[PDB]
């Protein structure tokens, strides 16, 4: 995926 | 060289923050569920639990000299609780975005918070928790803040912008900026605690841990031992080792002289997110928080 924002 | 023993393991919702109390046999854990817990790992009894919020609580530290815990959460708030009575001490909006990390000054009444709002902020509990300074310059989420234990008028921030900045309290511009070459950004920064080496260490999504000399502003070593994002890497206070943890589910103990992995531990709690070491090296205790709970280990 293009983005993996850090939410976990 | 290491006789590692499992002291206590507890299953829970994802543990995002963890810290040891310096004089009581306790760890604090902060959970993705919004709950925070205090455990006695020697008797294996929960001392206290608080449902702080419904959002994740990513950051938590003891302020033992005040009988407090301080926590930071995704609802933008810093909250402080007295651990003896459970009473909330203060509750304020600290940043307009997630709080990733909190550090507590060892002698002055100051706390630093690092945020997705691109800043670090300094709060003074002897001025009614006033915002005393905002440190600006980072260009992505600030993931980790740490005072230099040998010089706590200075501190480091690690950032997804691929830099570590070292700052001086009372000064608006960084002392310097280290470009880590960790192209996926920095998740964590930690200082070596002893005077024999002016070293810091960074952990990255790029699978690497890097050791930096903060005087020469140079990279001493790159340590690659994980298969997924490295959540943290820290120097142990009393043993010549580094401990890292990863979304690959492992903890690794590295020899701090040879930079080799000496032990790989799978505690079976899935992904690793956070780390703490007992501040005076009592039983050489370390503790790590994971998707499925936390574990406290003694090293011999």
* Assembly category: heterodimer
The residue fraction in helices of chain B comes out at under 10%
Specify the number of helices of chain A: 0
- Tell me the span between the first and last alpha carbons of chain B: 8 Å
| Largest interface, counted by CB within 8 Å of the partner chain's CB | A-B, 2 and 5 residues
**Largest sheet composition of chain B:** 4 strands, antiparallel
Main beta sheet strand tally, sense and closure of chain A:
none
> How much helix, percentage-wise, in residues of chain A?
under 10%
| Content-based structural category of chain A | little secondary structure
**Second CATH tier, the architecture of chain B:** 7 Propeller
Strands side by side in the biggest sheet of chain B: 1-28-27-26
CATH homologous superfamily of chain B? YVTN repeat-like/Quinoprotein amine dehydrogenase
Order of helices and strands of chain B: EEEEEEEEEEEEEEEEEEEEEEEEEEEE
Number of beta strands of chain B: 28
Structural class, judged by helices and strands of chain B? mainly beta
User: Percent of residues of chain B in beta strands?
Assistant: over 45%
Could you tell me how far the N terminus lies from the C terminus of chain A, measured between alpha carbons in angstroms? 16 Å
Inertia-based shape of chain B: globular
The radius of gyration over CA of chain B amounts to 18 Å
